[PDB]
Amino acid sequence: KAVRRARAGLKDPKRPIGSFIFLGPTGVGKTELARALAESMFGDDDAMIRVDMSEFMEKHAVSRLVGAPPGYVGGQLTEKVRRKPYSVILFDEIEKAHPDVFNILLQVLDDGHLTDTKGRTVDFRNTIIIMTSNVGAQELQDQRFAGFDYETIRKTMLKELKNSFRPEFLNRVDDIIVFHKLTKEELKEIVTMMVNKLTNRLSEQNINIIVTDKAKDKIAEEGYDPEYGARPLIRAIQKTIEDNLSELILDGNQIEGKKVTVDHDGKEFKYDIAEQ
Amino acid sequence: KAVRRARAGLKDPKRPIGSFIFLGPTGVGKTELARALAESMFGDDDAMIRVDMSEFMEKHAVSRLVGAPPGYVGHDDGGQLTEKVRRKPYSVILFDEIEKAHPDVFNILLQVLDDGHLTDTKGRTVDFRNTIIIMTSNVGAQELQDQRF
Amino acid sequence: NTPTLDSLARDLTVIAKDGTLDPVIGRDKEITRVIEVLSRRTKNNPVLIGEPGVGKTAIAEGLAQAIVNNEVPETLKDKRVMSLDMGTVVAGTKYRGEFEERLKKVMEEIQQAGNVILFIDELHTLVGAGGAEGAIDASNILKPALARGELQCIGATTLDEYRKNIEKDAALERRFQPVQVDEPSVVDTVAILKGLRDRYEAHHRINISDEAIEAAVKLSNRYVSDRFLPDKAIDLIDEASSKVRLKSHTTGMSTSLSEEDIAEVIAGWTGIPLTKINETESEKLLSLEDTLHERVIGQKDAVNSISKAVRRARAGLKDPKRPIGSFIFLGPTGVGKTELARALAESMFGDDDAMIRVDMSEFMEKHAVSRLVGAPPGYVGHDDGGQLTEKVRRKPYSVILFDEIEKAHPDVFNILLQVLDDGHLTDTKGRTVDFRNTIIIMTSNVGAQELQDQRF
Amino acid sequence: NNTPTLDSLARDLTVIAKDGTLDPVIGRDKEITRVIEVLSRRTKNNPVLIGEPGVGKTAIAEGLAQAIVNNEVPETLKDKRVMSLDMGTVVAGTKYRGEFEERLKKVMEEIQQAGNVILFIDELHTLVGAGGAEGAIDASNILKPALARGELQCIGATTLDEYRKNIEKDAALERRFQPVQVDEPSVVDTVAILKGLRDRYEAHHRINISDEAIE
Amino acid sequence: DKAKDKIAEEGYDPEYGARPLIRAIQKTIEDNLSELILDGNQIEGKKVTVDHDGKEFKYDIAEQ
Amino acid sequence: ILKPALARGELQCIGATTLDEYRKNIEKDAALERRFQPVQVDEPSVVDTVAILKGLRDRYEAHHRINISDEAIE
Ligand SMILES: Nc1ncnc2c1ncn2[C@@H]1O[C@H](COP(=O)(O)OP(=O)(O)OP(O)(O)=S)[C@@H](O)[C@H]1O
Ligand SMILES: Nc1ncnc2c1ncn2[C@@H]1O[C@H](COP(=O)(O)OP(=O)(O)OP(O)(O)=S)[C@@H](O)[C@H]1O
Ligand SMILES: Nc1ncnc2c1ncn2[C@@H]1O[C@H](COP(=O)(O)OP(=O)(O)OP(O)(O)=S)[C@@H](O)[C@H]1O
Ligand SMILES: Nc1ncnc2c1ncn2[C@@H]1O[C@H](COP(=O)(O)OP(=O)(O)OP(O)(O)=S)[C@@H](O)[C@H]1O
Ligand SMILES: Nc1ncnc2c1ncn2[C@@H]1O[C@H](COP(=O)(O)OP(=O)(O)OP(O)(O)=S)[C@@H](O)[C@H]1O
Ligand SMILES: [Mg+2]
Ligand SMILES: [Mg+2]
Ligand SMILES: [Mg+2]
Ligand SMILES: [Mg+2]
């Protein structure tokens, strides 16, 4: 919707295309969604401007954004945005910065302007700003009921965001989206996507793979862990698919140019080998 | 009333037209008021000399206001704010969100509010006596939110 | 005629007729922008902007070829491309007014000829060039002519030298039009190399195969992070060709490049083991657990996991987007885990000192994080850069040991998060260091004491 | 020879090698091979020798000069001249505008006309910013055009930290040199080195040096 | 006026002042106009009237 | 050399420079600064810019050999 408003010309000239906080559990596609947006707008993930806020644990690191004061030894963000004014900016995992680094963001969000230590103004008015976070996720496991869902999770995360960030910052964001924890069906679709991307990475090595739905479902149930989202699926793929193929191709290269089929027989994975 | 009092000629020559702290809850047009004043006085918002104090968090960033310290590389250039004011002595100056600056920045502002003069690090003195100085803040909003009854 | 200019400047048009200039491929959009700007009325001065090695000087050479080949609109069908090194202009102007007179003469000759397109490559040199205690620099002499359309002046410079030098002089900046030369894509780079190929075959006296072109582009794009695509792919093809020449020439005849001749060069540059797995290396990798148990007794599960990650990287199944492995080793004191990290480093490099080591017990204060990534711009020691970033950049295939992780301030590991997920860490200069080929081992003994002071 | 100004600014290492006064270079066959591979390149055929202080980089360039004299290099190099150029010598006596740019331009023309010269610039990090700054054009900017199209075959040596501090600040200059990593030799390699150098020290100190003294 | 009043209550949030009104204007007015104008340029040169019926906003297109 | 004549009124000398180069060069020599009177040329408005472009139009049409519409100016 924000991208369409920008392309329709309805977007207020004096403001960025959008500013979004992506909030949720760990391992839920919010940084992946930011990269997917960058790809959909520019054809590659590399076109995203990225700022990994954990580098900014201490206030004075803000000089990376706007440069060193006049006459002091030695801005990165200002130069990159001035070079590509139509771009996606990702401030990943905002809560790990020093709380008041984002005081610099305020003028960006309200005006779409930021001033460079050379006295030069850069206009973020055509950028999209995305800020991933997972405040509250630690508190969600500190919490235990000495006593006898989604909306309560949403509310407590939003409250912890209210605690961590000053009110005049949160007031400038155009939208604050909480991400749903993944369902097991969604995890099975993610397994299908990952297996596709593995297959067509390996195919240009001339290693041809197929994985049956039974095998993918076994992987999806092996990697299931709700508190960790999709990441434990990667580890399951590494253990099951990649380890045994690596053993085969190292042990006499017995796979190059052949076809490998992975299926699970109900007891264990099997790695049948055949010609095309 | 401050604008009208200055245009009537009754303003103290030694002082700026006005200095005002705008304070209160977020999203209440205290920045928009400064913008509207700038438009009413000059016909465009962009005539406002806007300074975003949230860049001045570290002590040494004050070099942007009055130039690099003596012997530093940019020392001959003078300050960016001093030169913008010297170039346009009738102007609205907005110090947005003052409380986010390092405390040391207000020591520079003191002589501006006291004599209407700012000494650039070159030693040149810039006269603010015809400017309007507006400072916005929202100190206490986090103290307001943790007022539980 | 232009008798001073002819002595000061190289004529690229005659050199293009001679034919020594290498061919330009695919850059039709940039050449079109250059033609559009040159056909302007008032400030027909394109400046080609981009990274080092992306091809800007090649764009100017391709424009000289296009003029010679009469592929240009009629207004350019008889134009001279003159490449004016400002060094040659400044050279020998010992006395007052000699530089100003020489450059004024050059401008007069350009004006009277009218058919010259000047090419001031390295345009950032033009600011202050020829200045002195009372001289007038080249920029202030050229400013009048650049703004009346009398000169047609192509320039080229890096983005950083543009910002640093000629965005200082805001009056000079106005007079040039930046044509952004982007880094070409993989497929564009393949086409570029195929077009250049004949020039390198004629030098090295070898056949350069298409799959070698594809290997060199893919590998140099994946593993050479400091340099940009066309230059570094040409570099990799040129060194692989030189290598196979040298090896065959000193004691069939139609020697041909191959993907392995490229892998050997890229492995020589980076130290990453990219050459084909021979049987000795494979037998060593398969017996890796046995080699690690020569120094670590027990701990079978850890040895297994480490060896499987090493095999998974050497096979080529590792996700390109992520480090080879990240491991936490957790357990009681005096039990193998640091010894296992050292055994792994020895098994991979023949020495324990090849391991990058970070003792987290000295990151007890949060602000110590500046050791990993450097001081912010403006603070003392900013020039020195990050110690971990420099060490990993200098040896991208290395074991990194983060020792005694629980003793560091809890926040300090937030810097690791991007390393573990992307395999990137950003140096405080803004340089990106890729950890994608490192193994990261973290060691801890949390809980292990509680497992003894638990008394039910 | 036909290069009358270069021969006054530089030292001909090839003749000094033919006079046998350069100490012998032992065991560095892989680095020498890499240098030969880079010099045989078509375009950016300039190696830069990178390593720690005292690992033996200048000794690599001298081993190359001796390889030239021994004609054991390929025919493409079999008659090259290695000329060590001190940048502090080039800037000597150049007070007036354009005098340094003229000197280095004439040097470059002489190199191009002779074609049989390999330039060696030890301590290459001095190259950037050499030649002053008050309206001067420094050596790096003068040489960048030639270094990228094969006219100059140039060998550099510098420490890792001076490379980082100086060369990589000018990434356009960085692109033009290929880093040849001069690793520290092993213990047994250093034993072989010292047993090779023995004769040169025995003659100077007029004493025998036992093997177990080397060990 | 009924549309303006509905926007003024959907955007009401007293701790955040006027800014949530902007988000409300964006969601209600600008989303649907951007859909209309991107879906076949059907707004250009025509008049649009926005009202609220007590269930939802309606976006009626007419000639001038 | 010129300070005497500029202060006497011997030369009717118009000059032009940017704000930055005025501040950097000729405000240092405060005696020379005194001899000149600054006329600030402000940036023209949007509508003034439209008028300027409609005035220049003939010169660009005759160069490019095309017609330039008013709405293209706007
Ligand atoms: N909903 C999803 N759809 C598809 N892939 C997903 C999804 N969630 C996670 N993934 C995959 O899981 C991996 C990690 O996803 P991320 O988006 O980085 O998790 P994240 O929570 O956004 O990371 P943070 O914000 O830095 S903690 C990637 O390989 C994604 O492709
Ligand atoms: N009282 C008001 N009257 C009119 N418009 C207002 C008012 N308050 C806010 N606005 C509008 O809502 C937006 C935000 O107003 P601002 O004036 O920027 O809020 P602000 O509180 O002044 O900013 P702060 O203090 O730095 S968070 C602008 O588009 C204003 O036009
Ligand atoms: N489109 C192209 N077609 C053919 N060769 C190309 C092309 N683009 C780049 N090259 C080659 O890339 C190499 C380096 O390109 P250059 O244009 O010389 O570098 P550059 O961009 O001028 O870098 P600097 O820093 O400005 S000297 C040369 O060998 C060119 O032949
Ligand atoms: N399983 C083992 N096999 C062989 N040597 C071992 C083993 N465990 C410990 N050692 C030796 O004991 C010494 C100490 O081993 P360490 O690995 O440093 O202990 P540690 O577990 O690292 O202690 P912490 O957890 O870092 S406090 C070394 O000399 C090791 O060679
Ligand atoms: N491979 C070698 N063969 C023979 N002698 C060597 C070798 N390596 C080093 N040496 C000797 O050890 C010393 C090394 O000095 P250098 O070669 O100048 O080292 P360096 O790295 O060039 O030091 P800098 O950087 O120039 S200060 C000299 O006395 C050399 O003769
Ligand atoms: Mg994130
Ligand atoms: Mg404000
Ligand atoms: Mg060039
Ligand atoms: Mg040396």
CA A19 to ligand 2 center in whole angstroms = 18
Q: How many residues does chain A have?
A: 276
Q: Which helix (H) or strand (E) element contains residue B33?
A: helix B30-42
Q: Are A255 and A247 in contact (CB under 8 A)?
A: no
Which residues from chain F sit within 8 angstroms of residue B76, using beta carbons? 24
Instruction: Judge whether D133 and D127 are in contact, CB under 8 Å.
Output: no
Residue C27 tokens read as: 């850059």
State whether residue F19 sits within 8 Å of chain B by CB: yes
Q: Are B3 and B17 in contact (CB under 8 A)?
A: yes
Stated as kind and residue range, the H or E segment containing A128 is: strand A128-133
Cα-Cα-Cα-Cα dihedral of C150, C151, C152, C156, to 10°?
-150
Please, are residues A181 and A226 in contact by the beta-carbon 8 Å criterion?
yes
Rounded to 5°, the CA angle A50-A53-A58 comes to 145
HSE-up of residue B39 (Cα within 13 Å, Cβ side): 7
**Dihedral (CA of C363, C366, C367, C370) sign:** positive
Look up residue C14 and give its two tokens: 């005659």
Strands A259-264 and A208-211: parallel
Burial A167-201 (b: 16+ CB within 10 A, else e): bbbbbbbbebebbeebeeeebbebbeebbeebeee
- Chain A residues inside the 8 Å CB shell of B65: none
Q: Are A219 and A233 in contact (CB under 8 A)?
A: yes
CA distance F66 to E16: 55
Nearest CA distance, A103 vs chain E (angstrom)? 17
How far off is chain B from E17, nearest CA to CA, in Å? 4
CA distances from D191 to C398, D25, D27, D30, D198 (A): 28, 13, 11, 18, 10
Handedness of CA A257, A259, A262, A268 (dihedral sign): negative
Residue B80 Cβ contacting ligand 2 at under 6 Å: no
Q: Is C128 annotated as a binding residue?
A: no
Spatial contact of F36 and F66, defined as CB atoms under 8 Å apart = no
Q: Which ligand is nearest to the CA of E25?
A: 2
D56 is in an annotated binding site: yes
Out of E16, E17, E30, the one facing A10 most closely (by C-beta) is: E30
Which numbered atom of ligand 3 lies nearest the CA of D44?
A: 29
Separation in Å, CA C98 to CA C17, C127, C450, D139: 34, 18, 84, 22
**Cα–Cα distance measured from residue C286 to residue A222, given in angstroms and rounded to the nearest whole number:** 27
Answer positive or negative: Cα dihedral of C185, C191, C194, C196.
negative
Largest CA distance in chain C: 103
Under a CB-based contact definition with an 8 Å cutoff, are residues C320 and C222 in contact? Answer: yes
Centroid of chain to Cα D191:
25
Burial of B94 (0-12, 13-18, 19+ CB in 10 A): buried
Q: DSSP secondary structure string, C98-162?
A: HHHHHHHHHHHHHHHH--EEEEEESGGGGTTTT--SS---HHHHHHHHHHTT---EEEEEEHHHI
Chains B and F touch (3+ CB pairs under 8 A): yes
Break sites following residues in chain E (C–N > 2.5 A): none
For D50, the enclosing helix (H) or strand (E) is strand D47-51
A179 CA distance to ligand 8 middle (Å): 50
How far B59 CA sits from the closest chain E CA (Å)? 31
- Tell which one of A32, A96, A195, A238 to mutate to probe ligand 1, the residue whose CB is within 8 A of the most ligand atoms: A32
Query: Which residue among E15, E23, E38 sits closest to A4, beta carbon to beta carbon?
Result: E38
- Residue B62 CA to its chain's centroid (Å): 13
How far apart CA D81 and CA D13 sit, in angstroms, is 8
Q: Please, where are the H alpha helices in chain D?
A: 6-9, 13-18, 29-39, 57-69, 87-90, 99-114, 139-147, 160-166, 171-174, 187-205, 211-214
- The ligand whose atoms approach the alpha carbon of B95 most closely is 7
For residue C99, give the nearest of C132, C143, C130, C134 by alpha carbon.
C130
Q: Which residue of A lies nearest to C383 if distances are taken between CA atoms? A: A73
Q: Cβ–Cβ of A60/C379 closer than 8 Å? A: yes
Token readout for A27 is 């391992």
B121-to-B52, B78, B83, B98, C379 alpha-carbon distances in Å: 21, 7, 12, 22, 21
Which of C314, C382, C417 has its CB closest to that of A54? C417
**CA atoms of C184 and C227, how far apart (whole Å):** 13
A132 C-alpha vs ligand 6 centroid, how far in Å? Answer: 5
CA dihedral of residues C61, C63, C69, C72 (deg, nearest 10): 180
Question: For residue B65, what is the enclosing H or E element?
Answer: helix B63-66
Nearest-angstrom CA–CA distance, A163 and C334 = 43
Residue for token pair 């409609």: F54
Q: For chain B, how many helices (H) and strands (E)?
A: 6, 6
Q: Which residues line ligand 1 (CB under 6 A)?
A: A 26-32, 92-93, 132, 134, 190, 229-231
**Closest Cα partner for D23 from D204, D206, D214, D197?**
D197
- Residue A164 contacts B, CB cutoff 8 Å: no
φ/ψ bin of C51: left (φ > 0), alpha (ψ from -120 to 50), beta (otherwise): beta
- Name the CA radius of gyration of chain A, rounded: 23
Residue contact C311–A247, C-beta within 8 A: yes
Q: How far is A47 from chain C (nearest CA, A)?
A: 12
**Cα separation, E16 vs A173, whole angstroms:** 12
DSSP-assigned letter for residue B55: G
CA of residue C228 to ligand 8 center, whole Å: 15
A104 and B55: CB-CB below 8 Å? Answer: yes
Q: What is the CA radius of gyration of chain D?
A: 18
Place of tokens 């794009």: C221
Chain A residue nearest residue C317, CA to CA: A242
Ligand 2 contacts CB of residue B30 (under 6 A): yes
Which residues, 6+ apart, have CB-to-CB distance to F48 below 8 Å? none
CA dist E6 to E11, E25, E57, Å?
A: 8, 11, 9
Instruction: Measure CA of the first residue to CA of the last residue in chain C; give whole Å.
Output: 103
Give chain C's length.
456
Q: Which two tokens stand for residue B40?
A: 């009413």
Rounded Cα distance, D66 and D82, in Å: 10
Long-range contacts of D160-167 (CB under 8 A, 24+ apart): D160/C394, D160/D50, D160/D51, D160/D52, D162/D123, D162/D125, D163/D48, D163/D50, D163/D125, D164/C385, D164/C390, D165/C383, D165/D125, D166/D125, D166/D128, D166/D129, D167/D48, D167/D124, D167/D125, D167/D128
Alpha carbon distance, N-terminus to C-terminus of chain B: 39
Instruction: Find the DSSP H helices in chain F.
Output: 3-8, 19-21, 30-35, 46-64, 70-73
Task: Give the whole-angstrom CA distance, residue C14 versus residue C81.
Answer: 9
Q: What angle do CA A52, A54, A59 make, to 5 degrees?
A: 110
Assigned token pair, C296: 């670590």
Pair A105, B100: CB distance under 8 Å: no
Tell me the CB-side half-sphere exposure of residue C91, using CA atoms within 13 A: 20
Q: Does A30 carry a binding-site annotation?
A: yes
Question: In the beta sheet, which residues pair with residue C153?
Answer: C118
Which secondary-structure segment (H or E) carries A122? strand A120-123
Using alpha carbons, select from C230, C223, C265, C224 the residue that is nearest to residue C244: C265
Question: Going by DSSP bridges, is the β-strand pair C10-11/C80-83 parallel, antiparallel, or unpaired?
Answer: antiparallel
CB proximity list for A212: less than 8 A, separation 6 or greater: A261, A262, A263, A264
Say if CB D84 and CB D101 are below 8 A apart. Answer: no
Q: Are D58 and D96 in contact (CB under 8 A)?
A: no
**Distance between CA atoms of residues E32 and C74, nearest Å:** 50
DSSP assignment string, A2-21 = HHHHHHHT-S-TTS-SEEEE
H/E segment holding residue A106:
helix A103-111
Residue type, C263: A
Q: Lay out the sheet containing C80-83: strands in order across.
A: C10-11, C80-83, C116-121, C153-158, C46-50, C177-180
**Cα–Cα distance, C399 to D137 (Å, whole number):** 44
Residue type at position D19? D
3-state secondary structure of D49: strand
Residue type, A180: H
In terms of residues, how long is chain E?
Answer: 64
Enumerate neighbours of D (3 or more CB pairs within 8 A): C
Phi, psi (5° rounding) for residue C325? -160, 155
Chains F and A make contact, 3+ CB pairs within 8 Å: no
C336 close to ligand 4 (CB < 6 Angstrom): yes
CA torsion through residues A7, A12, A18, A20, sign:
negative
A231 CB near a chain B CB, below 8 Å? no
Chain B within 8 Å of E23 (Cβ-Cβ)?
no
Query: What is the side-by-side order of every strand in the sheet holding A259-264?
Result: A208-211, A259-264, A269-274
For D33: left if phi > 0, alpha if psi spans -120 to 50, otherwise beta; the answer is: alpha
Residue in the block written with tokens 């006219």: D151
Residue A29, annotated ligand binder? Answer: yes
C297 contact partners, CB below 8 Å, separation of at least 6: C336
> Are the Cβ atoms of C426 and A58 closer than 8 angstroms?
no
- Bridge-based pairing of strands B49-52 and B18-23 is unpaired
| Number of other CB atoms surrounding residue C408 within 10 Å | 22
Please identify every residue whose CB atom is under 5 Å from ligand 8, which is an ion: C 57, 121, 156
CA nearest B51 in A: which residue?
A115
Collapsed DSSP state (helix, strand, coil) of residue C213: helix
Closest to C339 (Cα-Cα) out of C286, C388, C401, C290: C401
Look up tokens 């992780």; give the residue.
C405
Lookup: tokens for D205: 């100190």
- The amino acid at residue A72 is Y
Strands (E) in C122-268, as ranges, are 153-158, 177-180
Instruction: Give the β-pairing of A120-123 and B132-137.
Output: unpaired
CA atoms of E58 and E55, how far apart (whole Å): 9
Instruction: Give me the residues paired with residue A264 across strands.
Output: A269
Q: Give residue for tokens 């405390």.
A: B103
Strand C424-426 with C432-434, pairing: antiparallel
Listed residue (C372, C357, C448, C364) closest to C407, CA to CA: C364
Q: What are phi and psi of D72, to 5 degrees?
A: -90, 5
Q: Provide residues with CB under 6 Å of ligand 3.
A: C 22, 24-27, 52-58, 156, 158, 192, 195-196, 230-231, 234; D 43, 144, 148, 172
Q: Cα(A175)–Cα(A18) distance, rounded to whole angstroms?
A: 8
Interface touch B87/F19, C-beta < 8 Å: yes
Atom of ligand 5 nearest to the CA of D26: 3
**C297 CA to middle of ligand 4, Å?**
10
Residues in B touching E20 (Cβ below 8 Å): 27
What is the distance between the alpha carbons of residues C450 and C79, in angstroms, rounded to a whole number?
84
- CB C86, CB C119: distance < 8 Å: no
Is the CB of B64 less than 8 angstroms away from the CB of A117?
Answer: yes
Closest C-alpha among C280, C279, C289, C311 to residue A252 = C279
Name the E strands within C194-310: none
What is the H or E stretch that residue A141 is in?
helix A139-142
* The pair of three-digit structure tokens given for residue C131, joined into one six-digit string: 């200045």
